[PDB]
Design an enzyme around this catalytic site. Sequence first.
Site, PDB file in Angstrom:
ATOM      1  N   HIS C  43       1.053  -1.203  -0.046  1.00  0.00           N
ATOM      2  CA  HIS C  43       0.062   0.127   0.151  1.00  0.00           C
ATOM      3  C   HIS C  43       0.848   1.348   0.134  1.00  0.00           C
ATOM      4  O   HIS C  43       0.393   2.348  -0.091  1.00  0.00           O
ATOM      5  CB  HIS C  43      -0.943  -0.072   1.074  1.00  0.00           C
ATOM      6  CG  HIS C  43      -0.317   0.189   2.667  1.00  0.00           C
ATOM      7  ND1 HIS C  43      -0.273  -0.392   3.385  1.00  0.00           N
ATOM      8  CD2 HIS C  43      -0.122   1.530   3.220  1.00  0.00           C
ATOM      9  CE1 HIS C  43       0.274   0.046   4.347  1.00  0.00           C
ATOM     10  NE2 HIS C  43       0.387   1.356   4.269  1.00  0.00           N
ATOM     11  N   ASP C  99      -0.264  -7.439   1.852  1.00  0.00           N
ATOM     12  CA  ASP C  99       0.082  -6.148   2.038  1.00  0.00           C
ATOM     13  C   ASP C  99       1.859  -6.385   2.053  1.00  0.00           C
ATOM     14  O   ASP C  99       2.251  -6.132   2.988  1.00  0.00           O
ATOM     15  CB  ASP C  99      -0.462  -5.326   3.124  1.00  0.00           C
ATOM     16  CG  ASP C  99       0.076  -4.067   3.008  1.00  0.00           C
ATOM     17  OD1 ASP C  99       0.509  -3.588   1.897  1.00  0.00           O
ATOM     18  OD2 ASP C  99      -0.357  -3.004   4.029  1.00  0.00           O
ATOM     19  N   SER C 198       4.325   1.946   7.868  1.00  0.00           N
ATOM     20  CA  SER C 198       4.079   0.837   6.924  1.00  0.00           C
ATOM     21  C   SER C 198       5.257   0.554   6.284  1.00  0.00           C
ATOM     22  O   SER C 198       6.138   1.288   5.951  1.00  0.00           O
ATOM     23  CB  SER C 198       2.965   1.055   6.072  1.00  0.00           C
ATOM     24  OG  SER C 198       1.603   1.540   6.476  1.00  0.00           O
TER      25      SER C 198
END
Lengths: 28, 10, 249
Positions: C43, C99, C198
């Site tokens: 992402h 992800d 992330s």
Amino acid sequence: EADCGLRPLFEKKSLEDKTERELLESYI
Amino acid sequence: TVELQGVVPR
Amino acid sequence: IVEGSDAEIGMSPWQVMLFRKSPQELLCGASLISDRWVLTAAHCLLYPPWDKNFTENDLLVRIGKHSRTRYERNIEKISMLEKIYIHPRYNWRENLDRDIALMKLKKPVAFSDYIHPVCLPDRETAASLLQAGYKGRVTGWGNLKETGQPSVLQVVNLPIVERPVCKDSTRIRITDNMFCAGYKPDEGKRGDACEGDSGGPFVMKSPFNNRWYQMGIVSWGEGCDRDGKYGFYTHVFRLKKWIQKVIDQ
Ligand code: NA
């Protein structure tokens, strides 16, 4: 990688970081 | 869409 | 990283920063898995609800950094990306399943005291260490709170949480390709990853061979550090055959 996961300034010098005992202790 | 569940990707 | 601390120098030598070139922006964390392979959350590169779709020439990585206060001359290193590989079955729409992305570096980074690859988990480390209550370590330069960002790399140690607790904390249809970690509201500490974290590694030091293994990738959450909520992480061992297939092709 044959040498992966071993840090030049810590494991490779037999030195510990400040919070790794906290990790190794939880492995009970 | 994950925000429909209150989630944000990090 | 909420309720973390400043990392020591060389504490996470696998830490990688993913930047947008223009405008110069720190997008995400990442981790070094060889001299030319970097792992991050998919992402960070592709999230269509936010119109996000970065290509290789939009981006760079910085490796070996401790602090964003200054250029760490003769220490930090930089590379352009040769190729981006996003998981074929990444599910941005429903639950952020898989992800994960790999990034091939244009030029291989020289290892130093500050730059060193982390191990991917084997069958023993995954079966033995991926258990509720066992702690791992999350690192990043993301937001210090939910509702700004640090100069020095932040570190927090968080316990893996039992899957039924993870499941009932969220309305997301969670899968086996993710796990959750964090302290419970009746527990004696807190902390979480947050925005900007992330792609950063959830790592564990094996008591069996004293090597650091990357078990997860910071992926998602409901805010940051909320009581009764937990940070979710991409499960690296579950997706290890993909990682190897990409690297081997
Ligand atoms: Na929480």
